[PDB]
Each structure stands twice: as structure tokens, then as C-alpha cells.
Design a protein around this ligand. Structure first.
Ligand SMILES: COc1cc(C=O)ccc1O
Length: 328
């Protein structure tokens, strides 16, 4: 069988929390008044929710209302408990209220409003300094939720909401987030395709916070190289092949051999043999102003096959890449 794995940090955070903290199935939802909020316009519809701009008529403030699609009670409770646990943390989206939507008959989560610009437009005007600044802000959120025993599991540009005017950032959509428990096996069907860690792609279930760091690395690569997404696979199998064409196949085999993992035999005729590439390969005259030795080394230390070998969020915040970022 597979060799077991443990997070190298925050390993027993939940072990020593009171059970109320992580036992979300037993959580009792405290409901607000649904008539406090008025839907103004629909912003989007995902697989698990519909998102609306709204007004809180008790203060005439703009808010965001996320009306959950019918889904098993524990997943709904999971997201709620996680949001309440993390509320007030650095750059964590603030859950303001929970109400029962009369039409859907499901919980509607009320969030603080973030005046966002579309990431595709934003990622295209971001300066070298902007990228470092916002990366640092994401790291604050990730070290926080990891230190609080939670992995996000869906880090991607769409879930990093940025108000570029006030240089304000929020990590959103905690619907896939989970509590980390040492040696627990998790569903590998998480994260968006382009941001899936190698551990998910090789069906290794005993993963941890370090998954989020691979996803963050994918975001970084897309930003500094101006290629979104960076690893652009057509499906989950091609996704691993795309990664192997950059990181190389010999380190992939070292990875799966270390945890005594076996690849899907489906890869036998599509994976091939590939050398590890140097990151300078992806540098050109249209992105070189976003690239530095510090950037490439930081990226290199995020994008590792071995989840145990990736920088932790805290380690990442110590990296020379962030030396130029103004501290508060
Ligand atoms: C799609 O999930 C979310 C969306 C938003 C705002 O767009 C805020 C919090 C969320 O969890």
C-alpha cells in the first residue's frame, strides 16, 4: 500500500482544539433575518451556488449573498463552520450573516463586499511590485487558515478577490475547504484542473496544507510569465503530462516511488520521457520585467512534485522575493 504522509507543520492543530472546533457535523447554525438583505443583481452561478450583489437595508451597505445549491448538510455546515473559525483572520473573506433563503430553501451566506476587477484584465496590468505585494497578501491568508488547521483546496485566480484601488485582497469560496487531521484520507476531486497538485493527479489521498502551495505556485507562474493558466491540460491526465514536461519525468517517478504510489497505466503511452527544464525557458521580452532570480527561485520552491518538499506558507513569507515589498 501507499506510504503514509503528515503535514510538516501545524500537524496536530485540530488534535488539541476542542472537538466543537472541527466537528462541523454537530454545528448549530445561528440564523439572521433574511429580510435584512435585498438582492440587486446576479453576479455568477457556480456548481455549488449562485452569487448576488445585494444591499443590507439595516445599514444601506453593499454586501454579497451566496445562495447555496442543494447539497448534503455536512458540506454546507463544513463551509459555515470553517468561515466562522477563520473570521477576522488576515485577508479571509468575512462572513457577516447566514439567512434562510425563502425561494431556494437553502442557506444564503452574506459576505463583506469587495469591489473587484476581473482577474484576466487585472493580471495583465499587474507590475512586478503588484505581484509580489498580492502574493504576500495571499500568503497571509494561507498561513492563517493552515495555522488554524484548515486547507483551502481551491486556490485559483477567481477565488482571490482583489480591490486594486485600495489594494485590498480577500480569499473567497471556502466551499471545498477541509480540516486537516493527521493521516486522514481526502477526496482527490478538489481544486480546478489547472491548479491541481501532483498528489491529486496521481490519486494520493493523504495530502495536506501543502496542496494550496502548489496551487499558489501555479498562480505565480501564470502571473510572472504572463501565461494563464500556466499548466494548460485538456483533462486530468494531460494535466500531469503538462507538468511532467516542465518538472521532468524522473523526479515524477522519484515522487511516486517515495510514497510507493503506482501511476494509472493509462499514462504508459502518453507520459513519455522528459528532462527537467530551467525556468528561464519561459522568460521573454514581454514578461522579463516581471521576472527576477528571486521570483524564479521562489516559484521553483513552490512547484515541487513532493508535497513534503514545498515551502510552507510561513517559509514562503521569509523568501527574498518579498524583500522589496513594503511592510506595514
Ligand atoms: C463563490 O463563493 C464566494 C463568492 C464571493 C464573492 O464573489 C464571496 C465569498 C464566496 O464564498
Amino acid at each position: 500500500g501507499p506510504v503514509p504522509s503528515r503535514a510538516r507543520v501545524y500537524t496536530d492543530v485540530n488534535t488539541h482544539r476542542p472537538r466543537e472546533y472541527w466537528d462541523y457535523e454537530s454545528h448549530v447554525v445561528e440564523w439572521g433575518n433574511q429580510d435584512d438583505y435585498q438582492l440587486v443583481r446576479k453576479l455568477g452561478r457556480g456548481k455549488y451556488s449562485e452569487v448576488f450583489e445585494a444591499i443590507n437595508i439595516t445599514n444601506n451597505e453593499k454586501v454579497v449573498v451566496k445562495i447555496l445549491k442543494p447539497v448534503k448538510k455536512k458540506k454546507i455546515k463544513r463551509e459555515i463552520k470553517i468561515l466562522e473559525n477563520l473570521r477576522g483572520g488576515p485577508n479571509i473573506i468575512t462572513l457577516a450573516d447566514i439567512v434562510k433563503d425563502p425561494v431556494s430553501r437553502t442557506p444564503a451566506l452574506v459576505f463583506e463586499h469587495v469591489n473587484n476587477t476581473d482577474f484576466k484584465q487585472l493580471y495583465q496590468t499587474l507590475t512586478d511590485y503588484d505581484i509580489r505585494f498580492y502574493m504576500y497578501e495571499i500568503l497571509k491568508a494561507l498561513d492563517y487558515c493552515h495555522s488554524m488547521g484548515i486547507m483551502h483546496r481551491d486556490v485559483k485566480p477567481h477565488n482571490v478577490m482583489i480591490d486594486h484601488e485600495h489594494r485590498k485582497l480577500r480569499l473567497i469560496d471556502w466551499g471545498l475547504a477541509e480540516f486537516y487531521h493527521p493521516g486522514q484520507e481526502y477526496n482527490v476531486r478538489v481544486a480546478s484542473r489547472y491548479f491541481k497538485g501532483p498528489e491529486l493527479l496521481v490519486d494520493y489521498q493523504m495530502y495536506d496544507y501543502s496542496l494550496d502551495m502548489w496551487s499558489l505556485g501555479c498562480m505565480l507562474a501564470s502571473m510572472i510569465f504572463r501565461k494563464e493558466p500556466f499548466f494548460h491540460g485538456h483533462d486530468n491526465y494531460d494535466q500531469l503530462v503538462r507538468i511532467a514536461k516542465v518538472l521532468g519525468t524522473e523526479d515524477l517517478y522519484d515522487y511516486i516511488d517515495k510514497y510507493n504510489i503506482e501511476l494509472d497505466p493509462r499514462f504508459n503511452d502518453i507520459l513519455g520521457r522528459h528532462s527537467r527544464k530551467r525556468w528561464e525557458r519561459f522568460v521573454h521580452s514581454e514578461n522579463q520585467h516581471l521576472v527576477s532570480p528571486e521570483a524564479l527561485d521562489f516559484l521553483d520552491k513552490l512547484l515541487r512534485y513532493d508535497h513534503q518538499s514545498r515551502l510552507t506558507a510561513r517559509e514562503a513569507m521569509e523568501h527574498p522575493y518579498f524583500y522589496t515589498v513594503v511592510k506595514d
